[PDB]
C-alpha cells in the first residue's frame, strides 16, 4: 500500500543540514585541534543534542589488525546524580572495554589507560548538569592531564550550576550559543522542510503569509516544534486522502499545542 | 534417511579461516621464534579459544625412530582455583607421561625434565584467570628458566588479576586484542557462513538488506551468536521440510535471544 510506505517514512527521523549545525561543526574543529575545552549552551528545543551526533558521525573510529580502535571523539550522556564511578564506567564502555568489580581508584587508573594509547582528542558530555558536584574534579583532571578537549553541553541551568564553583567556570569559560529562528531564517527553514522533508505532491506553499502566521505562533522559532508540527500535520492529512497541508488542518494540529 | 544425515552435520563444528584468525597466527609466530611471552585479550564470544586451537593443530608433533616426540606447542586449560600442583599435572599429562604420587616439589622437578629434551617452544594457557595468584610464580619460573614462550589468553578480568602484581605484569606486558564484527566485515562473514557452513540446496540469500537487519540486532557482532543463530535456523527449518531459511523462521529463532 502506497500510503503505508509514506506513513512509515514520516514517522521516522532525519538530519537536515542547517546553519546552526554547520556553525558548530566548524567551531568544535577549531577546538579540537587547539585542544581546548568549552561548553555549548542554549534553550532546550534548539537541537543541540542532534548537532553533536551529526558531528560524531563524521569522524568514524579507525581499526587496524591488532590494537584498540582509534577514537578521536567520545560522546557520552550521564544518568541522574552521576557519581565518579558512573562517569568512568560510561567512558570505558564507550570504548568497548568491559568494566569489572573494583574500587574508585581502579576505575580512575583504568580510565586513564584506555584514554591513552587509543587516540582520543575530544570528550563531549551531554546534559552536563546531571553530574554531581564532585565529579567535576575528575572532568578537570582529565582535561588538564591528557591533551583532551572536553565539551560541556546544556541549558541555562547548567551555568547556574557552574557559577557555584570558580574552579570549573574558568576552565570552561568559552562557549557557543544556539538561538531561535526568525525572520528570513525561519521562513527559509520552513521552505527547506517542505521540499526536503515533507514532499507531498501538491506543494503546500507554507512560506505564504497565511501559513507562516500559523506556524510562527505555533512554533515560536524552535526547530523542535517546527518539525513536530509539520510532521503531525502531513501524517494526519494523508490519512484523510489529501495531498497538501491546508489552513484548517494545520490549525487543528497547532490548537493542540 | 537423508534428512537425518544432514541434521547430524549441522549439529557439529568446523573452523573457518576468518580475518581475525589469520592475524593471531602470524603474531604468535613472531613471538615463537623470538621466544617472547605475551598475552591475548578480548571478550568471551570472540572465538579466542578456537583461533588458538586452530593454531595448535598447524604444528603436528614430530617423531623419529629413537628419542621422545618433539612437541613445539603445548595447549592446556586449567580448572577453577587451579593450584600449583594442578598446573604441573596437566603439563605432564599433555605430554603423555604420567607420574603419580609424590609432593609438589616432585611434580616440579618432573615438569622441567619433560619440558627439556623434548623440544617445546610455546606454552598456551587458556582462561588464565583461573590460576590462583601464587601459581604465577611457577609460570614465571618456567618462562625464565627454559626458552619457552608462554602465552596467557583471557577476558578483561585477566588484566585485573595481572595488574595486582608487578612481577607478572612485566614479563607479560605485550598483548594482542580480539575485536568484534562490524560494517563490511560482518556482512562478508554472513555471506561466507551461508556457503561454507549451511549449504542448503536453495540459496537463502541473507546478505540482503532486509535480512541483515534481523541478524545485526540478534547478534551484536559476536561471532558466537552469529553461528548459533544460523545453525538453529537451518535445523528448525529442515525439520519442517523447508528448502531454505526465510524471514519468518529466522525471526522465530532470533525472538528467543
Amino acid at each position: 500500500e502506497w500510503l503505508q510506505a509514506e506513513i512509515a517514512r514520516l514517522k521516522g527521523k532525519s538530519i537536515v543540514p542547517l546553519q546552526q549545525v554547520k556553525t558548530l561543526h566548524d567551531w568544535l574543529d577549531g577546538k579540537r585541534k587547539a585542544r581546548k575545552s568549552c561548553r555549548v549552551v542554549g534553550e532546550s528545543r534548539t537541537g543541540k543534542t542532534v548537532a553533536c551526533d551529526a558531528y560524531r558521525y563524521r569522524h568514524k573510529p579507525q581499526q587496524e589488525a591488532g590494537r584498540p580502535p582509534t577514537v578521536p571523539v567520545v560522546y557520552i550522556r550521564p544518568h541522574q546524580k552521576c557519581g565518579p564511578k558512573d562517569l568512568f564506567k560510561k567512558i570505558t564502555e564507550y570504548l568497548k572495554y568491559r568494566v569489572t568489580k573494583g574500587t574508585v581508584s581502579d576505575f580512575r587508573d583504568r580510565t586513564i589507560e584506555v584514554l591513552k594509547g587509543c587516540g582520543v582528542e575530544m570528550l563531549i558530555i551531554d546534559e552536563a548538569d546531571r553530574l554531581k558536584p564532585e565529579t567535576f574534579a575528575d572532568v578537570r583532571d582529565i582535561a588538564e592531564d591528557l591533551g583532551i578537549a572536553v565539551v560541556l553541553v546544556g541549558t541555562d541551568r547548567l551555568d547556574a550550576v557552574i557559577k557555584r564553583d570558580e574552579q570549573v567556570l574558568e576552565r570552561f569559560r568559552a562557549h557557543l550559543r544556539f538561538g531561535k529562528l526568525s525572520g528570513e531564517d525561519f521562513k527559509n527553514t520552513v521552505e527547506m522542510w517542505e521540499q526536503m522533508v515533507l514532499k507531498l505532491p501538491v506543494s503546500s506553499n507554507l512560506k505564504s503569509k497565511e501559513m507562516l502566521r500559523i506556524l510562527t505562533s505555533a512554533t515560536e522559532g524552535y526547530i523542535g516544534r517546527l518539525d513536530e508540527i509539520l510532521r503531525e500535520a502531513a501524517i494526519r492529512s494523508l490519512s484523510r486522502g489529501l495531498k497538501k497541508i491546508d489552513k484548517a488542518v494545520l490549525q487543528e494540529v497547532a490548537k493542540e499545542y | 534417511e537423508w534428512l537425518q544425515a544432514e541434521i547430524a552435520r549441522l549439529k557439529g563444528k568446523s573452523i573457518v579461516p576468518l580475518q581475525q584468525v589469520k592475524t593471531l597466527h602470524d603474531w604468535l609466530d613472531g613471538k615463537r621464534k623470538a621466544r617472547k611471552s605475551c598475552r591475548v585479550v578480548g571478550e568471551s564470544r570472540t572465538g579466542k579459544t578456537v583461533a588458538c586451537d586452530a593454531y595448535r593443530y598447524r604444528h603436528k608433533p614430530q617423531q623419529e625412530a629413537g628419542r621422545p616426540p618433539t612437541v613445539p606447542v603445548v595447549y592446556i586449560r586449567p580448572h577453577q582455583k587451579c593450584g600449583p600442583k594442578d598446573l604441573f599435572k596437566k603439563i605432564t599429562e599433555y605430554l603423555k607421561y604420567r607420574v603419580t604420587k609424590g609432593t609438589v616439589s616432585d611434580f616440579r622437578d618432573r615438569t622441567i625434565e619433560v619440558l627439556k629434551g623434548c623440544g617445546v617452544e610455546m606454552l598456551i594457557i587458556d582462561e588464565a584467570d583461573r590460576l590462583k595468584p601464587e601459581t604465577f610464580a611457577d609460570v614465571r619460573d618456567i618462562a625464565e628458566d627454559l626458552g619457552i614462550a608462554v602465552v596467557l589468553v583471557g577476558t578483561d578480568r585477566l588484566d585485573a588479576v595481572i595488574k595486582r602484581d608487578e612481577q607478572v605484569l612485566e614479563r607479560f606486558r605485550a598483548h594482542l586484542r580480539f575485536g568484534k564484527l562490524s560494517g563490511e566485515d560482518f556482512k562478508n562473514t554472513v555471506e561466507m557462513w551461508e556457503q561454507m557452513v549451511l549449504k542448503l540446496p536453495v540459496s537463502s540469500n541473507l546478505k540482503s538488506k532486509e535480512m541483515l537487519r534481523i541478524l545485526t540486532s540478534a547478534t551484536e557482532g559476536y561471532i558466537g551468536r552469529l553461528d548459533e543463530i544460523l545453525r538453529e535456523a537451518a535445523i528448525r527449518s529442515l525439520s519442517r521440510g523447508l528448502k531454505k531459511i526465510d524471514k519468518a523462521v529466522l525471526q522465530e529463532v532470533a525472538k528467543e535471544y
Binding site: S14, I15, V16, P17, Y57, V197 | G183, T216
Partner: peptide, 14 residues
C-alpha cells in the same frame, strides 16, 4: 542537498 536518514547513519557507524 544531501539529507541523512537517522537510522542509516547509525547502521554505517564504526
Amino acid at each position: 542537498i544531501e539529507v541523512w536518514d537517522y537510522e542509516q547513519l547509525r547502521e554505517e557507524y564504526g
